[PDB]
């Protein structure tokens, strides 16, 4: 699926829809 990467406060995570 489409997943984007969010880097928040040093925490980079993939967020999938």
Curated annotation (Swiss-Prot):
Tissue expression remark: Hemocytes.
Cysteines engaged in disulfide bonds, as pairs: 3-16, 7-12
Residues with the Arginine amide modification: 17
Major subcellular site: secreted
Keyword Disulfide bond on entry: yes
Compartments where located: Secreted
GO biological process: defense response to bacterium
Keyword Nucleotidyltransferase: no
Task of the protein: Significantly inhibits the growth of Gram-negative and Gram-positive bacteria.
Family classification: Belongs to the tachyplesin/polyphemusin family.
Protein's UniProt name: Tachyplesin-3
UniProt organism field: Tachypleus gigas
């Amino acid at each position: 699926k489409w997943c984007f990467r969010v880097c928040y406060r040093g925490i980079c995570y993939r967020k999938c829809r």
